[PDB]
Structure 1
Amino acid sequence: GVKTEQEDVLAKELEDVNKWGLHVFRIAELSGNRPLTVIMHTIFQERDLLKTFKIPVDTLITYLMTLEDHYHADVAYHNNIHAADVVQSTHVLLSTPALEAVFTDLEILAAIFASAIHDVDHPGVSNQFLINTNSELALMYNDSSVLENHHLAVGFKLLQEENCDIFQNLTKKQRQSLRKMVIDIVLATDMSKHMNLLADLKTMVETKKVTSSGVLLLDNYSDRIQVLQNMVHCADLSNPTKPLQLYRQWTDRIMEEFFRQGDRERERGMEISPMCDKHNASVEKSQVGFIDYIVHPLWETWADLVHPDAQDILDTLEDNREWYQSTIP
């Protein structure tokens, strides 16, 4: 029913699929480590996407399970739980009142699909590490958005596996449009594009047009894709805006992943990357810095775009900043 199994209670947790702060770790446990499959299936059913795009349910489940299997179980942060989280967070953002009836079903499908594949086959090390170690991936992609190009290629390639083509009943034009949107969205998740992306989002907020009900008026592909890019980027950077217990766990996981990268750097006699040295870390201080320099500036701007829809998310972010500030040794 939920598309995996077994001994439920899962249904009661999934009632929060439309809420910020769904307990995605609980969902992962209750689903036998299939949070991405369970959450995607739930969202596709809720949004009636199977009917709209004539997606056979068995094809959807087969693709989701295959996709989920290509997130690495031994990567602490960039795994299937993170993918599930970003999907579900995008799903909530898409339903914000300021965006009512703004996006087509194909644009919604693109944002959700992009979210699901956006980190697939992540090795648990950064683009810069891949470049510095002369990896085959960095060679393939000429040092540019190395991971993000790879996530796209894998996510699309998996559609070709037996009974995995969830887009089989889209028209040729729809497939082309969705492909372009998905590429545009996932490439925008490269953190090196953050400053430019934000600057442009600020420009959009300055010139925003809304109806009397505060619904955004987007004029063209440029407007629509920019909103979707920033939406998924916000979802990717949403951990510090979540209920504190979720945020605390995400922080533990990213630090575990960073520290493992630092261990690889130390073993190779390389300079250890910022925040990756387990011997000299300031986890709490670094979270406060992350919020002050990256996450708050982004979310404050999103909050402006959709005002006042994101006020509670912003309030939670500010409370969570204080938690980490208060726990600096």
Structure 2
Amino acid sequence: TPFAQVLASLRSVRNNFTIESYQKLAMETLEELDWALDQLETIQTYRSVSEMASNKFKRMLNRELTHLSEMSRCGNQVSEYISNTFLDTENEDHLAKELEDLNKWGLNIFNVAGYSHNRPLTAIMYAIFQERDLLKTFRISSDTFITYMMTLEDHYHSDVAYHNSLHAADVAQSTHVLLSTPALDAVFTDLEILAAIFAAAIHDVDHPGVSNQFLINTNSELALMYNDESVLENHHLAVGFKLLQEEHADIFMNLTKKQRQTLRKMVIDMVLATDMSKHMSLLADLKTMVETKKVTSSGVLLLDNYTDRIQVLRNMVHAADLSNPTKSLELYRQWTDRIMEEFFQQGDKERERGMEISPMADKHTACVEKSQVGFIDYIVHPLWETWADLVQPDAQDILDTLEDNRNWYQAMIP
């Protein structure tokens, strides 16, 4: 395996390096080399050592297969097989005023809901798509677009307090605004933008107002069918893409097969990243991205390969999903009530199920203010602090707004 042999090579450097001002330089470097030696082995996990090993075996076989595919017609048939199988109105006036702020972080999605017959998702999506000229770009007839958009919005539960089309509309608009970050200009392709926005719009479709954990615990059909892994995220994606199958709703029908293939890859990639358990993994990638960030003249970021761009895009959607504490207090406060209401509904579901009440789920026991300060300090702030570093100086305001709201909720703890 590679790491085993790489460790054996450097271990040999240490043993053969040993074999006044010079002394200071000599000794300072030896313990530094030793520090890096321990830190290599200790920060190593099972899947990290394995990844380098699997990837060498993959590379090695692909060399042998390229050779074999040149031999006979048969060699080619065997190579192709092996390669593919074992290798990877008054309302319309106010709505328009609220929509002036479509590219602004401070848009009030709640008023958008109010002036749009409680259809903020269709309202905001059509607005975004006209703003980004995506309907023209990707040959999407309005008729088809709204047909899809309406069905999508229909499969967002009305009865659910937080994970309703209003949350979807917020993430969609928030993602739209994050894409406009100056630091990321020519950076993404039109299909990448299309993927991102559609990803955001569907990221929570048919959400039943309960956690994956609840679904697993209650042995739900949904858990059972998705083998307890990313049960909801998989379900959202499945609905999102199946809705395209409805009568005159295929918004992607005018893209090439490759375009659709790629878009489907990215959309799956991004919505799966909205699993809150994938949080640390996303934050890890974003931190490494900041560390090795390369910036082209006048401030615009330099993201080469797809791998880099998708890391940014899935982090962008995740950051947009966790945007509420960074919004104005008037907005943020309403999201807090909405989240709690949903949390308490799950608690009621557990009470009659005779299940031990979920942490936060009982309105009788809930602490809220102290909770938001926990949520900010440990999850929201680290994420946004990282994002703001990557996109500096932009998003400095998003952070100050968050920091202020943290202090406000801190000041509310009885």
TM bin (shorter chain): over 0.9
Which amino acid in the other structure matches residue 185 of structure 2? Answer: E
- Report which stretch shifted further, 203-212 or 315-324: 203-212
Which amino acid in the other structure matches residue 293 of structure 1? Answer: Y
Which amino acid in the other structure matches residue 208 of structure 1? Answer: K
User: For 1:8-57, what per-residue CA distance to the aligned partner results, in whole angstroms no more than 9, with x for missing partners?
Assistant: 31101100000002000000010001100010001100101011100001
Q: Name which one, 1 or 2, has greater alpha-carbon Rg.
A: 2
Q: Would you say 1:19 and 2:81 are equivalent positions?
A: no
Partner Cα separation in structure 2 for residue 138 and residue 24 of structure 1: 32
Partner Cα separation in structure 2 for residue 53 and residue 200 of structure 1: 31
Please name the residue that 2:183 is paired with.
98
Query: Could you tell me how far 1:268 is from its partner in structure 2?
Result: 1.8
Which amino acid in the other structure matches residue 297 of structure 1? Answer: P
Please name the residue that 2:29 is paired with.
none
Please name the residue that 2:378 is paired with.
293
Which amino acid in the other structure matches residue 60 of structure 1? Answer: F
Please name the residue that 2:56 is paired with.
none
Q: Would you say 1:241 and 2:241 are equivalent positions?
A: no
Q: Would you say 1:177 and 2:268 are equivalent positions?
A: no
User: For 1:265-295, what per-residue CA distance to the aligned partner results, in whole angstroms no more than 9, with x for missing partners?
Assistant: 1222212112111111101000000000100
Q: In the TM superposition, what are the counterparts of 1:103-182 in structure 2 within 5 Å?
A: 103-182=188-267
Identity %: 86
- Secondary structure of the equivalent of 2:252? coil
Which amino acid in the other structure matches residue 145 of structure 2? Answer: L
Query: Could you tell me how far 1:215 is from its partner in structure 2?
Result: 1.1
Please name the residue that 1:250 is paired with.
335
> Contact conserved, 1:96 with 1:309, CA < 8 A, in 2?
yes
- Report which stretch shifted further, 290-299 or 213-222: 213-222
User: For 1:69-109, what per-residue CA distance to the aligned partner results, in whole angstroms no more than 9, with x for missing partners?
Assistant: 00000100000000000000000000001001100000000
User: 2:310 aligned to 225, 228, 231, which one?
Assistant: 225
Partner Cα separation in structure 1 for residue 298 and residue 348 of structure 2: 53
Please name the residue that 1:260 is paired with.
345
Which amino acid in the other structure matches residue 294 of structure 1? Answer: I
CA distance change for structure 1 residues 97 and 7 in 2, over 3 Å: closer, same or farther?
Answer: closer
User: 2:146 aligned to 61, 73, 76, which one?
Assistant: 61
Partner Cα separation in structure 2 for residue 24 and residue 268 of structure 1: 35
Which amino acid in the other structure matches residue 214 of structure 1? Answer: G
- Secondary structure of the equivalent of 1:280? coil
> Contact conserved, 1:24 with 1:85, CA < 8 A, in 2?
yes
Partner Cα separation in structure 2 for residue 113 and residue 98 of structure 1: 22
- Report which stretch shifted further, 215-224 or 138-147: 215-224
Partner Cα separation in structure 2 for residue 107 and residue 184 of structure 1: 12
Partner Cα separation in structure 1 for residue 383 and residue 358 of structure 2: 24
Larger RCO: 1 or 2 (CA < 8 Å, sep 6+): 1
Partner Cα separation in structure 2 for residue 273 and residue 308 of structure 1: 40
Please name the residue that 2:12 is paired with.
none
Which amino acid in the other structure matches residue 144 of structure 1? Answer: E
Please name the residue that 2:293 is paired with.
208
CA distance change for structure 1 residues 91 and 127 in 2, over 3 Å: closer, same or farther?
Answer: same
- Report which stretch shifted further, 318-327 or 213-222: 213-222
Partner Cα separation in structure 2 for residue 198 and residue 6 of structure 1: 41
Question: Please, which runs of 5 or more residues in structure 1 have no aligned partner?
Answer: none
Partner Cα separation in structure 2 for residue 6 and residue 126 of structure 1: 36
Partner Cα separation in structure 1 for residue 396 and residue 178 of structure 2: 13
> Contact conserved, 1:5 with 1:32, CA < 8 A, in 2?
no
CA distance change for structure 1 residues 197 and 56 in 2, over 3 Å: closer, same or farther?
Answer: same
Partner Cα separation in structure 1 for residue 277 and residue 352 of structure 2: 26
Q: Would you say 1:282 and 2:367 are equivalent positions?
A: yes
Partner Cα separation in structure 2 for residue 267 and residue 102 of structure 1: 51
User: For 1:136-181, what per-residue CA distance to the aligned partner results, in whole angstroms no more than 9, with x for missing partners?
Assistant: 0000100000000000000000001001000010000000000000
Partner Cα separation in structure 2 for residue 250 and residue 29 of structure 1: 16
- Secondary structure of the equivalent of 2:364? helix
> Contact conserved, 1:35 with 1:80, CA < 8 A, in 2?
yes
Which amino acid in the other structure matches residue 94 of structure 1? Answer: L
User: 1:198 aligned to 259, 268, 283, which one?
Assistant: 283
Please name the residue that 1:43 is paired with.
128
CA distance change for structure 1 residues 110 and 269 in 2, over 3 Å: closer, same or farther?
Answer: same
User: For 1:285-325, what per-residue CA distance to the aligned partner results, in whole angstroms no more than 9, with x for missing partners?
Assistant: 00000000100000000000000101000000000001101
> Contact conserved, 1:77 with 1:254, CA < 8 A, in 2?
yes
Query: Could you tell me how far 1:211 is from its partner in structure 2?
Result: 1.1
Partner Cα separation in structure 2 for residue 134 and residue 70 of structure 1: 23
Question: Please, which runs of 5 or more residues in structure 2 have no aligned partner?
Answer: 1-88
User: For 1:206-247, what per-residue CA distance to the aligned partner results, in whole angstroms no more than 9, with x for missing partners?
Assistant: 111111322111111110100000000000000000011000
Partner Cα separation in structure 1 for residue 304 and residue 402 of structure 2: 31
Please name the residue that 2:49 is paired with.
none
Query: Could you tell me how far 1:5 is from its partner in structure 2?
Result: 9.3
* TM-score, length-scaled by structure 1: 0.98
- Secondary structure of the equivalent of 1:8? helix
> Contact conserved, 1:185 with 1:228, CA < 8 A, in 2?
yes
